């Protein structure tokens, strides 16, 4: 219903039809210069990862760390 977001500034409020918060970690094509990309938010269900994507899902307000 509310999740932590990538940025501390954006609204924790989830779009209607979610109570799954997620933490998504992966190497994009800048991984060698910048490190892994990180994304926090809401999903309808635990999102379907592609190869190499670390993912952690939880279902309580602002649980995604």
């Amino acid at each position: 219903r509310t999740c932590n977001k990538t940025f501390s500034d954006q609204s924790k409020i989830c779009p209607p039809g979610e109570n799954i918060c997620y933490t998504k970690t992966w190497c994009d094509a800048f991984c060698s210069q910048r490190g892994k990309r990180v994304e926090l938010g809401c999903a309808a269900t635990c999102p379907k990862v592609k190869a190499g994507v670390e993912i952690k899902c939880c279902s309580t307000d602002n649980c995604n760390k």
Partner: antibody
Amino acid sequence: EVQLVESGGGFVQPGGSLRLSCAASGFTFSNFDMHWVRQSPGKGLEWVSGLDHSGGAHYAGSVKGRFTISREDAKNSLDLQMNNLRVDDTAVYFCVRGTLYHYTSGSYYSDAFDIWGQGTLVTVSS
Amino acid sequence: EIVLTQSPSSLSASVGDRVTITCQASQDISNYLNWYQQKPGKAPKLLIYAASSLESGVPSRFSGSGSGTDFTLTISSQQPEDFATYYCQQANSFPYTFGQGTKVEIKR
């Protein structure tokens, strides 16, 4: 829902001025690099102007000294003031959000243009 | 300024065909190169950033490669919804520039 909605489109005489505006919604506007991209009928895309989250302004050579880009963070608005307009400035103008990607190493701005408004037409004609 | 030249400007594909579009940059742009799709009457949509990284929601049949001056967009199986204009764009240095666009049309 992330929305960029352009307004201020219309017709203007050559040598005339026209202010475009963009109402942003569903993100923390003040944190984002914002851009203007235009497209002449039947032709391709041209970057016009960018304004960084930190206030630095960037203009394409064709528009430098004629166009002024600005933001009002409080009103979630981006403006483009166009002056000394010529026929060849006739285009659909798109409001565009520069990406803001987060890594262990920090924040990176305007790697790409992830959100496009549906664009407003500006016709410069006598 | 950095000029991007796409090839071809138009290509004919059948549904199922593997489609390749080249982007050549007039100077080294590392991997700061993006691919956009545009349909008629509609705004461009980001497919690929950093020369080979897919944007969220983009189907896996889109793939990108290259660095320096030499870049390639691949659609591994052309679908009905993929008949569209594709643009490359460099985010290496101001002013940001686009290739001239590649129109993918139906072969017959």
